[PDB]
Amino acid sequence: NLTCDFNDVYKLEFHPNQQTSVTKLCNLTPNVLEKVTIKCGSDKLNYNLYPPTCFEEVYASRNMMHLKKIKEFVIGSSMFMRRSLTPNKINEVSFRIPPNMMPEKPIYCFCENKKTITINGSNGNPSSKKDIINRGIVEIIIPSLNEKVKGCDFTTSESTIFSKGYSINEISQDIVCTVKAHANDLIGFKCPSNYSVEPHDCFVSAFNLSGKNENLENKLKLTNIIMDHYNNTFYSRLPSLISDNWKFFCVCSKDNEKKLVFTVEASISS
Amino acid sequence: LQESGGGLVQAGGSLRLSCAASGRTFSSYGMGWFRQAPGTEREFVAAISWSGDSTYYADSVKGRFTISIDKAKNTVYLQMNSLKPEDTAVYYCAADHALVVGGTYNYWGQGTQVTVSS
Ligand SMILES: *[C@@H]1O[C@H](CO)[C@@H](O)[C@H](O)[C@H]1NC(C)=O
Ligand code: NA
């Protein structure tokens, strides 16, 4: 779930003779790699999301006041989904929480329903117009990691994200980066830009020791998968229970260069 | 790479294969035994982590073969028991990603032949 639904759940509809603005708060506390979602407006509900490009732009402040580009404000943010429910509007948005080693920090978006009402007066208080707003606040707490992701940065030996890394002088015999992983472990790797990743859907499927592609769903169901093809960056989390010792591989390759092999040894654990 | 220890054995019997690596080229690597017979593809048999703390077996040999390692002498052993005619093949020692990287793997040796009579 992890969803702020202002259409159906945190309803922003105005009520008969409502005269006073109302604000509702939807607080989400995702873990790393999890997906958060806002639903704001539909074919029948005329509600507007602020900033309009949320989550690509967010507000740093709960009072809706300091606009940030999330790719700069929460480094690593890169996976986004958007959906229109009515023409020329984006009403449903999602983003996946990237690994973050900086302290916890909020990000805000807002859903608004507006209307102008006439306040009928009397006895020396003339009638007036009043704009009222039902505002939904989306507060996402960006969690903090206390250890590096178990995995391989093939772009630098001074990685801030990954437990192991390789310098350009080393990647310029194949490199085989091995991680030993247990249940619920967060793993991943990053390959240089113009390298190809096999299988393309690494972590949904992978190479096995026979060198064959296998879909991992029935052997080792990695969860919360991020396949950032734009940045050649891959993350997932090991399942909550591991009943067998497994080894799987993904391979980054570029013509006339050594291959960069990522491997995981998953061990029995609960 | 020195691959040795193969030969002719009666069905039901045991053989112990040895793979001696006279270099540091393989100590970053998990190590595997692979096998191929005329008419079939090269297949995975068993692998062991560089520490020795982890082992993996092809389903068809689990419970009959054991892989083990002697790091001081850079040697990998495959102890084969209850041998089956199905096990007849040339056996090869290689880093355990050898089949993963395919045609770029540059250290395949001649291997050691194993024939199981019936
Ligand atoms: C690798 O996957 C193939 C196809 O899914 C399968 O036939 C083979 O047995 C697998 N090998 C191992 C070592 O799991
Ligand atoms: Na060679």
Residue numbers in the entry:
A (entry chain A): 28 to 199, 207 to 304
B (entry chain B): 4 to 121
Direct quotes from the study:
On the merozoite surface, Pf12 is one of the most abundant GPI-anchored proteins and forms a heterodimeric complex with the secreted 6-cys protein Pf41. However, Pf12 and Pf41 knockout parasites have no growth defects during the blood stages and polyclonal antibodies against either Pf12 or Pf41 showed no growth inhibition. Both Pf12 and Pf41 contain two 6-cys domains and the crystal structures of the individual proteins have been determined.
Nanobody G7 binds to the bottom of the Pf12 D2 domain and not to the D1 domain, which is consistent with our mapping results. All three CDR loops of nanobody G7 form contacts with Pf12 residues and cover an interface area of ∼ 722 Å2, with CDR3 providing the major contribution to the paratope. The CDR3 loop forms a short α-helix, which bound into a hydrophobic cavity formed by the bottom β-sheet of the Pf12 D2 domain. Interestingly, the Pf12 residue F283, which is crucial for Pf41 binding is also engaged in binding to G7. We propose that G7 inhibits Pf12-Pf41 complex assembly by binding Pf12 with higher affinity and blocking the binding site for Pf41 ID.
